[PDB]
Each structure stands twice: as structure tokens, then as C-alpha cells.
Amino acid sequence: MKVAILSGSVYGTAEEVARHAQKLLSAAGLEASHLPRASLDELKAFAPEAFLVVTSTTGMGELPDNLQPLYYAIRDQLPAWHGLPGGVIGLGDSSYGDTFSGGGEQVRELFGELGVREVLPMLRLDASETVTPETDAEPWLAEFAAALKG
Helix, strand or coil: CEEEEEEECCCCHHHHHHHHHHHHHHHCCCEEEECCCCCHHHHHHHCCCEEEEEECCCCCCCCCCCCHHHHHHHHHHCCCCCCCEEEEEEEEECCCCECCCHHHHHHHHHHHHHCCEECCCCEEEECCCCCCHHHHCHHHHHHHHHHHHC
16 A cells, blocks of 8 residues: 655654654555655656645745645645545644644645545644654554554
């Protein structure tokens, strides 16, 4: 089962979470790949059977520059990914006021528009409560793999 792992990151934190996710899901036997700065061409070639998106939110409450263009491309083209399983990890900070993971929510909305089935609730990782987001994502990732396998 091919799992496309997408990331949105300003300073690399969500990207490191995504890379961690790739190793864990691959360890579980999934054909998981992290595709940073992926294009529609790359996803088409990959032919994903599942999606994991790991994204922060910018200070302006938008998806980061390395996920926003792809987001718009997917929304505009709407590939026939209806029914495929998906999950979202949202990196926020309640200190800043991003208590909800804005970028993450926008991805959830895109899943709805595509017909991608959210298999787990979004993981909300908050900098005001953790400094080890990779490690903290592990229990959710364990359940996520179970949802795919599964």
C-alpha cells in the first residue's frame, strides 16, 4: 500500500515530523514516501493509495509556502482520490493563538472536497505543550498504520 506523505513547513519542524512518519510507517510494512515540495505530476506518478499530511500554519494563518501551491493545484484539479484513506497532523501553537491548527483544518476541508476518508481525528501538536513533536506523534502514527493495513 502506497502512502504519500505531504508536508507544509516554514522552518522544517513539520517536515521532520513527516520524515519520522515515513520511517515508522515503512517499518510497519507500508510503502510510505515523504514527498517534500511534491507536485501534481509527482503524485500522479506515485499513484498514492493513502495520504498523510503534516503541516504547520504560517503567522498569517495560511498553509506554508512549500504546501500552499500544491494545495491549490489539488483543489483545482480534483483527482479521483475519492474513498482513499487519509490523516492529518497539525502543528500549531496556542501561545500564538493557533489553538486549532489552521493549516491542518484547511487540509481536512480539502479531504472533504476530494472524498478522502479521514481515518483518524487530526493530531493536534502544540508547541506550548511539547518540544518533541516527532516523539509525541508516535502513538497516533501507530494507530494510523492500523487504519491503513488495516
